[PDB]
């Protein structure tokens, strides 16, 4: 498909959209040692 | 007792028993080491010169003793240990060309002992 829409901005603020997104932070990375596999996730 | 079994440990009641090198030499001039876990009974007599490059076998360490540690939730119980990465190989002499082939390596099955 194709889809045509808009983003805008008052000031700093992207107040127009059809999807906003927002993230939650206070992309966290951690190596989880278990057993004889410490991997990242 | 050019071929040593460390008998100055045994005098000393076993204050070490380092069994993991080399004994001694043989005749003045093979130096002799233990196959802990020969499968019957045998010797192989080996050459070696100075030169890393004539041996007629390789062994080139790249990770060694390297630490291994973690944790298992089952139990909480520890992990550790230790991981390498070394390689092994052979004077070319041309694995499928070195069964019986080398000839820096002879090897003697010994019956009768």
């Known amino acids: ?41 | 007792g050019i071929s040593y079994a460390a008998q100055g440990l045994a005098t000393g009641f076993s204050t070490d028993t380092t069994k993991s090198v080399f004994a001694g030499v043989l005749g003045g001039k093979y130096r002799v080491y233990i196959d802990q876990y020969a499968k019957q009974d045998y010797f192989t007599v080996g050459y070696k010169g100075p030169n890393e490059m004539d041996a007629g076998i390789y062994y080139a360490p790249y990770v060694a003793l390297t630490p291994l540690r973690g944790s298992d939730p089952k139990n909480f119980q520890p992990v550790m240990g230790f991981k390498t990465r070394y390689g092994i190989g052979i004077n070319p002499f041309a694995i499928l060309n070195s069964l019986g082939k080398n000839a820096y390596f002879r090897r003697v099955y010994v019956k009768g002992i």
């Not at chain 1, 603020?13 to 990242?40: C, H, N, R």
């Open chain 1, 1 to 41: 498909y194709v889809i045509v829409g808009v983003v805008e901005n008052i000031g700093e603020k992207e107040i127009v959209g059809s999807i906003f997104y927002a993230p939650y932070t206070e992309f966290k990375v951690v190596v989880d040692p278990e057993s004889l596999q410490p991997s990242i996730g």
